[PDB]
Design a protein around this nucleic acid. Structure first.
Ligand SMILES: [Zn+2]
Ligand SMILES: [Zn+2]
Ligand SMILES: [Zn+2]
Ligand SMILES: [Zn+2]
Ligand SMILES: [Zn+2]
Ligand SMILES: [Zn+2]
Lengths: 68, 261, 49, 48, 23, 185, 157
RNA sequence: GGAGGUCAACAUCAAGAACUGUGGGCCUUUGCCUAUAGAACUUAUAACGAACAUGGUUCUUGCCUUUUACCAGAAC
């Protein structure tokens, strides 16, 4: 089998976080646990972010993110 | 037929109007994980619903029906379901037949598809107990009439009967003047549960009477499970019922059994 | 640093992201750095809270 | 400052227009070969 | 089924392709 | 290991009648609703296209001692609730056999382990005032009967059937253990 | 690459203006449907995304029909678009393949993601779902692919 | 068929200065002697990374009321 991943628009991501930003509902009590999980992996993210800083001569860099 | 089986069921509330989450001000700051308030303690939060279902008015046909669901939309049993005919979970009162379907599975779980626990709860709380059938509801804090005391305990009676009556088949209703409670009892476990989740936190009389405008600040009537009836009469009656029931089912056991010989 | 090597770990070969990006739950796209900086602030924050 | 919840990207920042980086003058004589690509984000994604 | 049957049949869906709702 | 090893214990009825089924395996799923310890949980939908997903609510240690289908929670052999089957089984013989089970918390947890099985397992308005009301008979049965030959308020304390109807057309059609009076003012 | 204008971004090709407004009308609406309009129900929030997915799909169908179908633009316009993230290279690469011609998305053909098997019911032709509706008689339970809101994505329906 | 991919999986990467296969002869399968073929990648101011972090245990010290947190050398 193995098709590769499917890249998707940036919006879908922005909408996602721009919703789960406000959490007070019940339907997030899974996501809530999810969050605690990623707390383990955060420092990784930091690294993989902060080694791509854009360098003085580039204005804006664009990257590839892999999101939950 | 012409009532429920005819016209597709309807929305009650627009998702806009849907009530505010984040319950409001029992204490200082708002905890995110649990949804509560933080420090201090005040007399418990509960209040009458702004809502109620309307047994024949809103009930109708929906998606789960055409697709064959079982469990009943509880946010319909509050007539609070904002999905209208879209909701999968069924909108309407239990007939006998639906219970005909569930009754395979009603050992473990309710008519709303949820898993009954075992030991009830300190107070006789919200979902039942698979160790036991209970068809019978305690009703307390009847002061969800507000405090206007109605000219006869038989006006209580007419009112309790008026309400719980609609929701299904019934055995009986005993109001008690001595102690404030109604005890009601039905046919089907199914009906029972359905009525329970429906009738929490309500107020009373006509589309308006007396203090009807302010009905909304009442506490609302507790509806909780009932224990035994410790009189001998009812009790003898019970052991009879079970007895004749065994008497039926033995027939089943000898049919499939005797076939297996 | 030169007097004391480390001499790495054949078999390290199973990275995090490879393992992660394989599941249902993760998805992939592109986006401006600064933005991803910010999303990481919201993230980090909501967690610690 | 701490009271000041950081402003989201889709609104404030995405419309602002970037305001030029370092680079450096270079030349059309000395640096002629490299003046094209020297400052690309990745200099040559393609030159086959 | 037949090609004519399909081609005629589809226009029935409310909104073109493919989000368009049959019924 | 062994957690897997006693396998699922499942009805062949409620399990649903399709030819082929798939069911998940989750090695530490829920705890029992009974003994309150973990086990392997098994989903599945009955049929493929269903909306509703069967889950398994209990151990296989706990569903053995009482001998029941982990989904159903009926008897394995007789498709019957415990509190029935061991009640019938109480009757013939004469008195015995009920299963006293587990209040507190680690009483039930503890009690799960020991292998003794359990008794069940061991083996396997116009006011109409109509009186004479019988003790054991419900309203459903009353207006049942009425709608069966063709709306009510009863008081079982006083054995006095109070009654009302929509139109006196149902007065004739009503008439056309019963004390009759057609009573209204 | 960058959707942002920036100095590196090679200035527009020519026919651009003729299409430019049609593009912008989609674009505003994305800014419209990312606006965080709250709802307590999961069913909704996923719907909300079903917009963004739909628009994105239409924009790409549009550029695609221009370039390949009617050939109303020039190869450098097109390739500049795709370089600027106006449309999915990939997705269009499916629409060129035989069957897929009307496809949703690229999750809806993923074999590996789905629990078992494959390919959201999203793909199957109505011409069959109707067959199980015949035999079983429950009509047909399907309406929206949880990922998109496809309904009969396959290129017959 | 060709080119490509910030795609995937499965192998292999530190040693007698060092790999593998095959033929013939001997002991009796390993192994020894001899003949023959092919040998990607990595190595001599020695090595997968003309780069450079952390942890554990065991010792020697330094801070020095004690434990985390530590000071700077070594071995595994
Ligand atoms: Zn509903
Ligand atoms: Zn158990
Ligand atoms: Zn079963
Ligand atoms: Zn799709
Ligand atoms: Zn799909
Ligand atoms: Zn589709």
């Amino acid at each position: 089998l193995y098709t590769p991943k499917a890249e998707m628009p940036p919006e879908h991501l922005r909408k996602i976080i721009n919703t789960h930003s406000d959490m007070a509902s019940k339907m997030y009590n899974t996501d809530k646990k999810a969050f605690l999980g990623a707390l383990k992996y955060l420092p990784h993210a930091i690294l993989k972010l902060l080694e791509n800083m854009p360098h003085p001569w580039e204005q804006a860099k664009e990257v590839k993110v892999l999101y939950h | 037929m012409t009532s429920w089986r005819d016209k597709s069921a309807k929305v009650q509330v627009k998702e806009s109007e849907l009530p505010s989450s984040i319950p409001a001000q029992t204490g200082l700051t708002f905890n995110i994980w649990y949804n509560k308030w933080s420090q201090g303690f005040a007399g418990n939060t509960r209040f009458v619903s702004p809502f109620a279902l309307q047994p024949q008015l809103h009930s109708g046909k929906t998606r789960g029906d055409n697709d064959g669901q079982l469990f009943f939309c509880l946010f319909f049993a509050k007539g609070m379901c904002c999905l209208g005919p879209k909701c999968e979970y069924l909108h309407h009162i239990p007939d006998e037949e639906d219970i005909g379907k569930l009754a395979l599975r009603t050992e473990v779980l309710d008519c709303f598809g949820r898993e009954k626990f075992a030991d009830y709860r300190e107070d006789m709380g919200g979902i039942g107990s698979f160790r036991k059938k209970n068809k019978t509801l305690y009703v307390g804090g009847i002061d969800g009439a507000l405090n206007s005391k109605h000219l006869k305990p038989a006006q209580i009676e007419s009112r309790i009967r008026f309400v719980f009556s609609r929701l299904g088949d019934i055995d009986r209703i005993r109001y008690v003047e001595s102690k404030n409670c109604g005890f009601v009892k039905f046919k089907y476990q199914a009906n029972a549960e359905f009525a329970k989740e429906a009738m929490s936190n309500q107020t009373l009389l006509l589309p308006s009477d007396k203090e009807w405008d302010d009905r909304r600040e009442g506490t609302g009537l507790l509806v909780k499970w009932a224990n035994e009836d410790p009189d001998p009469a009812a009790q003898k009656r019970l052991q009879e019922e079970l007895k004749l029931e065994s008497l039926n089912m033995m027939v089943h056991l000898i049919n499939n059994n005797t076939n297996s010989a | 640093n030169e007097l004391h090597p480390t001499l790495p770990t054949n078999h390290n070969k199973t990275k995090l992201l490879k393992s992660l990006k394989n599941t249902k739950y993760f998805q992939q796209t592109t986006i401006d750095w600064v933005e991803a900086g910010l999303q990481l602030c919201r993230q980090g924050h909501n967690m610690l809270n | 400052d701490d009271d000041e919840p950081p402003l989201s990207y889709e609104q404030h920042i995405e419309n602002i227009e970037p305001l030029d980086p370092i680079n450096l003058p270079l030349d059309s004589q000395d640096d002629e070969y490299v003046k094209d690509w020297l400052y690309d984000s990745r200099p040559l994604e393609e030159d086959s | 089924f037949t090609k004519s049957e399909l081609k005629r049949r589809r226009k029935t869906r409310k909104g073109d392709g493919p989000w368009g709702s049959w019924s | 290991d062994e957690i897997n090893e006693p396998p699922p214990n499942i009805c062949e009825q409620c399990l649903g009648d399709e030819a082929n089924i798939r069911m998940t395996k989750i090695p530490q799923g829920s705890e029992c609703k009974i003994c309150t310890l973990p086990f392997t949980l098994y989903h599945f939908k009955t049929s493929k296209r269903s909306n509703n997903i069967i889950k398994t609510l209990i151990c296989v240690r706990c569903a053995t001692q009482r001998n029941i289908c982990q989904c159903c929670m009926l008897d394995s052999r007789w498709h019957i609730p415990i509190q029935l089957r061991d009640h019938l089984i109480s009757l013939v013989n004469e008195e015995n056999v009920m299963t006293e089970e587990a209040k507190n918390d680690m009483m039930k947890r503890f009690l799960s382990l020991k292998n003794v099985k359990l008794g069940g397992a061991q083996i396997t308005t116009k006011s109409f005032f109509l009186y004479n009301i019988d003790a054991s008979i419900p309203e459903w049965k009353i207006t049942d009967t009425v709608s069966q030959l063709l709306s009510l308020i009863v008081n079982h304390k006083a054995k006095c059937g109070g009654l009302r109807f929509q139109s006196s057309e149902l007065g004739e059609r009503f008439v056309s253990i019963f004390i009759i009076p057609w009573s209204s003012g | 690459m960058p959707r942002i204008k920036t100095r590196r971004s090679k200035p527009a090709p020519d026919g651009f203006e003729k299409i430019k407004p049609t593009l912008t009308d989609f674009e505003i609406q994305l800014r419209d449907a990312q606006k965080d309009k709250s709802s307590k129900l999961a069913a909704k929030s996923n719907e909300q995304l079903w917009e963004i997915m739909q628009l994105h799909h239409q924009r790409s169908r549009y550029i695609y029909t221009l370039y390949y179908k009617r050939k109303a633009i020039s190869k450098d316009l097109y390739d500049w678009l795709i370089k600027e993230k106006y449309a999915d290279k990939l997705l269009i690469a499916k629409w060129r393949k035989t069957g897929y011609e009307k496809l949703c998305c690229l999750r809806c053909i993923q074999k590996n993601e789905t629990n078992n098997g494959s390919t959201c019911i999203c793909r199957v032709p109505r011409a069959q779902l109707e067959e199980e509706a015949r035999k079983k008689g429950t009509q047909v339970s399907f309406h929206q692919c949880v990922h998109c809101g496809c309904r009969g994505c396959a290129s017959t329906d």
